[model samples]
Target: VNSFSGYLKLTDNVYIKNADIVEEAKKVKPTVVVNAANVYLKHGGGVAGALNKATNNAMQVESDDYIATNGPLKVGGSCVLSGHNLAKHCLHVVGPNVNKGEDIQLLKSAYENFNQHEVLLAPLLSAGIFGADPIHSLRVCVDTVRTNVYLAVFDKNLYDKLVSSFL
Candidate 1:
């Protein structure tokens, strides 16, 4: 986790707090969770580490976890996919066609029963899926989803906020 005491902290757009991400997440039970990890240390435990811990915790609580990708799910592989194993369910939403994109539907579906579930552990990079340079890829892939139904971001001071809030 990062401390909100650097030059970046002075930016007005950035926000910070010492609250807990997991605790706050549990309190809200959001429909769709968005974590912008494009910068660094997206979550308190980091991406895979946090997801694993959260998945274990959610299982104990009888909650479902949904995951997604903003770009490629994984790198060219020899056999079975590996990195994605960290997340619960991985949804792919990258393509050229913007009008009929299914990302909107996917997001809506995720949001439908969001509170009933425990976490939607999406990383800033690949939204927690597995991809190389996914943080930057997420920037270009943001346009593929429907506007009204889905929310997307290129960058936000999420690192500062999460680190400040829950570190």
Candidate 2:
């Protein structure tokens, strides 16, 4: 239903927009969703947690199974898993911990893992418990997203700030 665009273009095929990812996960398609994921891809909190809640925990079921099957994903590593309910697919990426000195290369590596989808629904990654500065992390997102990105920021205050800063 989020068909309208209030986007700031970052590069060719990349656009940053604001969205409630809970809704996005409920009915997005032919698109890959990116999770600001933990190394375990546990859907424990942040974007993953909300999305897991949106999908009625079906998404979490799959995610846990993936971890059991694949082992823990390394920081900056990503993997594809089938999306539950309305989402067709999702990209689970372990984002870098900025406080720990893991920086843009790993964060950029996360963006590089997008699965060739024309449209990707992603978040302001690693700005949660992994401790990235949102503005700094957003810069990495701007540089690395190589395809059409319907990247979303869920918070209104941050949305206005980032949008204005980009302006």
Candidate 3:
């Protein structure tokens, strides 16, 4: 029963979608899908685990290399990983941790730092396993992305519930 409830056009190209991100990825085939990672880039659960499984863990190798050269990504910092299954690139950005309290500004800065592209997919930062408030987190995402983007939401009920509010 999980599926996209609907979508919204924030701008001519930018969009907010209430859909299963993985399913939507098949159609969008984005150039880059943003990964809201922890500082260590370890894929344990939530969107991180989903991306890890999708890319067959290829991202982990690149993440390790990134850490080696650039050190761990700060809360608002990011690194890009290429050679993945879902997309040609994956942008790994460190998001806020629930244990550290809500830091929407940090999440906003993370999106602000992302390199603009023609087509990109991103999850609502810190909303999943990070225990962020989904509605508020999504608002931050919608506001931060300056160019064309596909905003992915995994839970259909949640999507349905929120889509109308945003629309």
Name the best candidate (by TM-score): 2
List per-prediction Cα lDDT, in the order shown: 0.29, 0.74, 0.73
Any runs in candidate 1 off by more than 4 Å, and if so which?
A: 1-24, 34-46, 55-121, 127-131, 147-167
Q: Go through the candidates in order and give the C-alpha RMSD of each one to the true structure.
A: 12.9, 2.6, 4.0
Cand. 2 TM to true fold: 0.85
Extract clashing residue pairs from model 1: 17-164, 17-165, 18-165, 19-165, 37-124, 123-127, 123-128
| TM-scores of all candidate predictions against the true structure | 0.30, 0.85, 0.85
**Candidate 1 at 53: error in angstroms?**
1.6
Q: Rank the candidate models, highest TM-score first.
A: 2, 3, 1
Over 4 Å off in model 3, which ranges?
A: 1-7, 11-13
lDDT for position 141 in model 2: 71
State the number of backbone clashes in model 2: 0
- The 10-residue segment of model 1 with minimum total lDDT is 74-83
In model 3, what is the error at residue 159, expressed in angstroms? 0.5
Residue 146, model 3, lDDT: 70
Task: List, residue by residue over 31-96, the lDDT tens digit for candidate 2.
Answer: 577887877777877888887877788888888888888889988888888766646777887888
